[PDB]
Amino acid sequence: SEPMRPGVIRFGLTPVFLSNDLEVLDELQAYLTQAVGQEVQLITQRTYQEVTALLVSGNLEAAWICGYPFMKFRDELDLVATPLWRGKPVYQSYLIVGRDRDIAGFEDCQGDIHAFSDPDSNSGYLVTKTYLAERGVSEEGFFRKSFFTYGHRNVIRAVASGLADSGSVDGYVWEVMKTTEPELVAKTRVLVKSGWHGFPPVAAAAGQRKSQAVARIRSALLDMNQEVLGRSVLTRLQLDGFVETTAESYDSIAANMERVRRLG
């Protein structure tokens, strides 16, 4: 009950997938500082589990996490805002293979070495795990080996370089990189696209509905197109902005989590 507050407002995220990442991070840190009206520090961690645990335990004010970890810690978290990409707050998981790989569909990946992105990513893990669960298999049964690359861009590199025969990646990442690193991406192709799911949201700890810091962060995200600097960050990410959503937008993820739970 003695309150504990941080020395600065902290916004957590996982590493940005772009090549000029320090530039995007600097502009985003500047934007949020400018919009919130006091210093904001960006805290990057490698994995979704680390970002999420920091947020749940009160060591961040907000964080950009995946819908999967959000749904896992749903009672301890509140949604702040969801990104818009190509006009909509949704995205797909892609199952990718080498550009010239001679195969017809998903079942031909049996026996592959498979690159997943993060065990707490919807698009880098859970969707593919759902395909497998529905057919009575798990990654250890279906693939000869699988591994986590801890980044979507890294899945693409692992498949492009031939260390993995197939991989599971965020379809937003793959499409954005198709334009920013076209020579890299041209070494892969999309074998399977999933259904649409809610785009990875920004969330806050549930004890913080009343927090002035959370409210200002929320307005900063929602108003990000109103400022030159905010537009600049959005342009580099190819996002359109942020919108308000509710947990219902993440129901297709929760439904897949339940399908996977019911695998033996």
Residue numbers in the entry: 41 to 304
Anything the authors wrote about it?
While the majority of both structures overlay very well, there is a significant difference in the rotamer conformation of Tyr88. The change in the side chain conformation is further associated with the backbone shift for residues 83–88 and a significant conformational change in the loop region comprising residues 53–61, demarked by the black circle in Fig. 5A. It should be noted that while surface residues 59–61 in the arsenite-bound structure are near the neighbouring molecule in the asymmetric unit, they are too distant to be directly involved in the interactions, while in the apo-AioX Asp61 interacts with the side chain of Arg281 from the crystallographic symmetry related molecule. These small differences in molecular packing support the idea that 53–61 loop conformation change might result in the generation of a new protein interaction surface. The fact that the arsenite-bound and apo-AioX crystals displayed differences in molecular packing (forming weak local and crystallographic symmetry related dimers, respectively) supports the idea that loop conformation change might result in the generation of a new protein interaction surface.
